[model samples]
Target chain A: MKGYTVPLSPRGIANLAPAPPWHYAGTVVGVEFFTDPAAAAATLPEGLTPDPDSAGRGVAMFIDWQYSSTGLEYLDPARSQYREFLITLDAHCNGAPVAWCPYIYVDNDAAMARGWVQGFPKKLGAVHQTRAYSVGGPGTPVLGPGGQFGATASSAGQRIAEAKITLEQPVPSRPVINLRHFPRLAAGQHDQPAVHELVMSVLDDTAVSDAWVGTADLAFLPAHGEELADLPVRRTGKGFHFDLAYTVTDLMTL
Target chain B: MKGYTVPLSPRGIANLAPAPPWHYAGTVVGVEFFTDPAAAAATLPEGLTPDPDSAGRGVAMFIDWQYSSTGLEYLDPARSQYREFLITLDAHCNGAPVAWCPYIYVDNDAAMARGWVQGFPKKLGAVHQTRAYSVGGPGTPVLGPGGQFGATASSAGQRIAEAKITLEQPVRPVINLRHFPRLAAGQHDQPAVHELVMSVLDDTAVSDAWVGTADLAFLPAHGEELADLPVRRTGKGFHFDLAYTVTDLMTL
Candidate 1:
C-alpha cells in the first residue's frame, strides 16, 4: 500500500489572526522605610528630628554616615563616609527571581539641595555627590575658616548595619513582545524586519527609604512581557488577579 | 483702632500636603472582524457606506473610512486589500480627554513574494485615507509587474466618511497630579505649581455612522473624578461572602 498523506487546508496555512495584545493596568499601594543603624544600635532612624548640634552650623557640615550592601569597599575613602544596602524581590518573572543592591549617601546642605543621584560618569559642580554630611556638632570643638573632621565609629554602629524594606504594594508590570516578517525583494534576495511592542500600565506612588531626610530620585528600565501558564494568583475585592510581578534591584545610597 | 495684624509662626508659613497623583489602568476586552460586504455594510449605520459602481466600472475598488473617539484606525497604502481593527481605550490627562486611534493592515505571501512593498513601520501606522466600496474597488483589473497595482482615488469620488461611537462598558480612569516646590534658590514664592491630570475608559460596543469603529480609546476630561468612581454595585461572592451593596471609589 502507498503511504497515505493528509492534505492541509488553506485556512490552516493562512494567518488566521494574531492573538490580541495583552492589556494591563494597576496602581502603587504604599511606601515604607527602614534603617540599618537603628536596627543595629537600636537607635531611632535618622532625620526624625533636626540635628540640634548641627543647627546654626555653617552651610557645610558632616552628619553621621552608615553603610549597607556587601561589595562597596570604595566608600572607605579617607575623606568620605559610605552606606550600602540590598533590595531583594519577593516575586519572580518567568520563574526566574532577581535582586538589586543600591547605595545611598547623606550629604551636607550642598548635597541635600542637589537631590537624588544615580548612574556612572558622575558630574562635577552638579550639586549631588555620592558623599555628604552636616557641619556643626557638640563633642567636637569649633574649627577655623575651613577644617575637616573624621568620625570614630559609634559604639552602636554595628547594630544598624543593614535595612530591609517592604513596599506597600507590588510594582507595576509592563512587558513587551516582538513580531517579525520577512519579504523577498527580488529573485533569491530577502530581507526581514521586526516590530517591537509591549503593553504596560503606568504606576504612580511615592517612594520611601530609611534616611528620609527628604525625597530621593530613582530610575527604572522599560520592561518586557511573557506568557506563563502556572503563574501564581492573588485575590482582590473584585476577582482573582494574576501576580505578574517583576524585580527592580536598583541600588540606593545615603 | 489699629489695623489687624496676623501672627506668623517661627516655622515660617505652613505647607499643605500634595494632592495624591492620578492613577489609571485597564485591559483590552474584545476584537472583531468585518468581512462580508453586505454584513459589513449592515454593521455600519445607514448613509455611511457608499456605492462603488456609481463612479463606473473602471474604478475597481472603494473603501469607506470613519473615525470615533473610542476607536483607532490602521491603514497601509502599499497593499490594495489590507486592514484590521482592535479594541482600545481613550484616556484623559489633566482634565482634558484625548482619543487614541490605531489602524490594521494585511500581510500576505503574495505581497511579500512580489517585492513590491516594504515592511510595516516599528510603531503601528494609521489609515488616514479611507475609501468606500461605492467610491472604488481593488483598483485595476490586472496586477502590474512585480505585483504592483494602481489603487488611487477617482477625481470625483467621495472620500471615506467618519463614524461616531459610544461606549457600553465603563472605561478605566487615569489621573495624574503634579506638585511644584514652594521654595527654589531660597526664594519664597506663592501659588506653588499644582495641577491634576485625568483620563477615562473607552467603550467597545458602540459604533457610529461613517465606518467609524469604537474601541477603548475615548476619554474625556472633567474637573471631577467621574471615571474613578465605583462603576458597579456588587452583592455577594466567593470565600468570605458579604450580603451588602458596595459603591465607594478606592485609591492606591
Candidate 2:
C-alpha cells in the first residue's frame, strides 16, 4: 500500500503525524488593541470585511503549546510542544463577526504545516513567552495580581513583536478566520489563484481556565517582507493570560 | 472520534490532503556543478559529511509537476499541480553517498507542507520553467536537437536563480538527509529530527532524457543564501520526464 496521506508511507509514518482530532493545551498571553481602521481593513482578504462595530479592533498573542493526537505525542516533548505568535483583526463575513489572522508565526514545522492546511499563513519564526511555574522562581511569573509576563516574536534575527502585561482582573475567546490562499503555479495564471477561501477553524470539547485580564503594552516593528507593523497599535486595551484546551475537528469555509 | 492524525477532522477533510502512495509526473530541467568545498561542507548538518570525492558537487533543478493519490486529484488540477525549485548538495551520511537539500521552494502550500513533513525545508517562492508542447508553436520549446529551455526561481520579488539549457545529447540522479531543527531556547542547534531518509518512489520511470552544457546564475537575495554556493564551474544540463509513486520513506 502507498501509505496514508502525505509525505507517503515510510516518511509519513516516520514523523509527519497521525490523522487528527488534534488536541492542544496551551498557556497564552495576549493583548487586545485597536489599529487604524484603514490598516485593519487592508489586512482583510476580499471575502471578509471590517466589523462595522469594531472595525479597528485587533489582538496580538503568544502561545506556548503542547499538542497531541491519538498517539503518545505528549510523551515526546520535542514533537508535541511549540511556540506561536499571531495577529488577528476583527472582521465580518456575511455580517457575522469573525477574527481574521493577518500574520502568524510558529517554531514547529509540523505546526506551520498544519496551520497552512487550516488557512492560517504560518511562517517560521522564534516565539518566546515568559513561563508560569508551579513553584515560584526568579524568572517564573505567577498568575496573580502582581504577576508580570512578557513575550516576543522574531524572524531572521529581527524582532517583530513584543508584549508585556501585568495581571489585574478576568476575561474570555473565538474561532479564528483565515484565508486559504494558494496560487496557481502555471505561468500567467498566478493572479487567478487556485484556492482563495475564507475559512473558520472548527473546534470541539473546548475548555478555558486561568483566564486573567490586566494592563498591557504591545508593539509591532517593521520587518522584512512583513506587514505586521502596518497595523500599528492605536490604543492598548486589556491584556490576558489563559489556559486553553481544544480539539480541532474541521474548518468551515465562509 | 478525535480524527485520523493532524489538523483534526473537518479541517483535514477540507483540503489538507489525502493518504499517499502519491504519484507524480513532472517535466524537469536542471544543472549540476561544483562549488567551493568549504561552502558545501558548511551547508551540511551535523550527522552528514561532505563527499570526499566530490565535496562541492550539487544540482539545482526546477520541476513543473502534477501529483495525485487515490483520489481524483488529477481531475482537480488546482490540487495536483505545482512548481518547485530546489538545490541539492552532494554529501555522505555514514560513509554512504547522499544528497542534502539545503534549500527548496514551491508555489503550492500543500506541497510546501508535504515537503516539511519529509524534511525538505521548503519555502514559498515563484518558479517558472519553459514549456514543451506536443505541437510546437512560436513559444514552446521542442524535445530534439537544438531545443533550448530556460527556468527561473524568485522569492520576495527578487530573482534568485536562473538557468538555460540547450539540448545536445542524454544522462542520470537519491536518498536525502532530513535535517530539521527546532527554535526552542535550550534546543536551538539540536534538530527535532536528524535522520537519513529516502522518499522511496515506486514504479519510477524516466523518459525523454536529454543533456547538454548549461549556463547558470544565482543572485543574492535577502534572507536567502542561494548565491553562497558560488558556481565554480558549470556542468551538464539535463531535461527529462519522470513518473513515480511515492509510497514510503526509508531511513538509512
Candidate 3:
C-alpha cells in the first residue's frame, strides 16, 4: 500500500505497481564469492543481520534493462521506455541472501528516483550492455573479443567496472528477496544519529526468457567514497541474466 | 642504479634517491584486511607479484609526511613539508610482503616528481593532516570529533577518503620492501612503456612513542579505477615518524 503512485512525470516516484506491467529485456553477468562475511554483515543496517554464516559472500550483476509499463496495453507506443543500466550485489540480511544494490547508474532521472526509494544506492553514470558476433549465421554465438557476455558501467566519462563472461550454465528462477536499508540521520545526534528504514522487495516482473550461469572476468574500480570497495571481488561466481517481473514484497520500519 | 639526481626542476626524474638520505616524519594511520590478494597482486607491475599465497589480501594507509633529506638538512629550509598524504598497500614480491605505492596526493610539485622515479603510483592532490592536542605541554590526545587520528586527501576539490584512527599497533618496521617502478614511457622507448625497480629499504624512523587500539570507520570516495574500499579496517596499524635511508635495494 506504499509506493510511488499517479501523476507520473519525467522524474519522481509515481505509478510503479501492484505488479506494474514492467518489461525488462537485458543481459546480466554476475559472479559470487566468499570473503569477510562479517564485514559485509556489519555494513548493513544494524537491525538487519547477515544470512547465518553468510561467509561475507557477494554476488555482483551487470544488467542492462529496457523497462515499460507494458501491462498498461492501453498506452500508446510513446509509452515505450529506453534501456537503462541496473547493477545489484548480494549482501546477506537477517541470515538470508538478499540483493543489496550498492551502485546503479541510470540515465533516466524518473527511474533513478524510483530506485532511490528502494534503497538502490544508485548513482548517475553511463552503462552499455551489447552483444557482438561474427557475420556467420543466426546460429553463431554473440561474443566480444574477450567473452560471450559483457557489460560496462562508467561515470564522468571513465569506465568504473566492466565484466565479460566466457561460458554459460542455466539457472532456475525462484522466489527471492532483497534488502534495501536507507540511512536517515537526524540533526544533533551522534549516538542515535543513524536511523534506517529496511524494505524487503521482490521484483514484480519474473517472467524471464532464460537464465544462465558462467565464469566471469570482472573488475570494478574503486569509486572513491563509494563503499563497494569494502567488498573486494575475490573471483567470479555465477554469471546470470533474465527478463522478469519485479514486484515489491514487504516494507518495514524496524 | 637508475633514478634522479642533481638540479631537480619543476618536473622530470631530476631529484630523488636511489640510495640517498631521506628523513620521513609523519603520522600513518592504516587499515588492513583480507581482500582478494590476487586482485592486489594483479594491480602490480609485471616484474613484481604479490606473495604466492596472496589469496587477495590488502592493507591501506593514510599518512601525513614531514619530509626532509636530513643529510641535506643543512642545505635548505625548503624542507618544511605539509602533512603530505601517502597511501600504500600490502603486496609481495618474490614472496615478500612488499609494500606497493598506489595513489598519493601532495600539494608539492617538487615532491610529486621525486616520487615519480620511485614508481610510487603517485598523483597530485591536496592533503590535510591536522592534529588535536595541548599546545606546548606535550599536549593531550589530538583527537577528532570522531577518532584519535585522522587525515583527509582531496583532488581537484573533492574528498576521496577520510581516515581517523584511535591508536596504533605494533608492526615490525624491519624486513620491509616497497616498489619504485617508474615508467620510462619516453619517446625513445621507455622500456617499451614502464620498467619497475623494486626497493628494499628500512625506515630510519621507528618508534612506539604512542600506540593504541580503536575502531576505524574510514570510507574512501570514488575518483576512478582506484578503490581503497576493499580495505576494511580491522585494526589500526601505527603512528609516528622516523629518519632513514630509502636507498635502492635492487634494480629490476
- Please compute the TM-score of chain B alone for each predicted structure, in the order given: 0.17, 0.91, 0.68
CAPRI-style quality class for the chain A–B interface of candidate 2: incorrect
**DockQ, ranked from best to worst:** 2, 3, 1
Residues A1-254 of candidate 2: C-alpha lDDT, one tens digit per residue: 23323566644675455566677877788999999999999887888887989999999999877776765354344456678999888988888888989899998888887787789899999887665433232223457786777778888778898888889876544558988878998999979989988888888777777788999999899998888898889889988988777777678987
Alpha-carbon runs more than 4 Å astray in model 3 = A1-25, A70-95, A132-140, A143-147, A171-195, A247-254, B1-252
Cα displacement (angstroms), candidate 3, residue A138, comes to: 10
Off by over 4 Å in 1: A1-86, A89-254, B1-34, B50-252
What is the Å distance of residue B49 in model 2 from its true position? 40
A225 in model 1: Cα distance from truth in Å? 27
In candidate 1, residue B184 scores what lDDT?
Answer: 65
Name the better of 1 and 2 by DockQ.
Answer: 2
Question: What is the iRMS for every candidate structure?
Answer: 31.8, 25.4, 28.6
The runs of at least 3 residues in candidate 2 whose Cα sits more than 4 Å from the true structure, single-residue gaps closed, are A1-5, A171-174, B1-252
Top lDDT prediction, candidate number: 2
TM-score of each: 0.14, 0.50, 0.40
Q: In model 1 chain B, which range of ten residues has the least summed lDDT? A: B236-245
Q: What is the lDDT of residue B95 in candidate 2?
A: 85
Residue A220 Cα positional deviation in candidate 3, in Å, after optimal superposition: 1.5
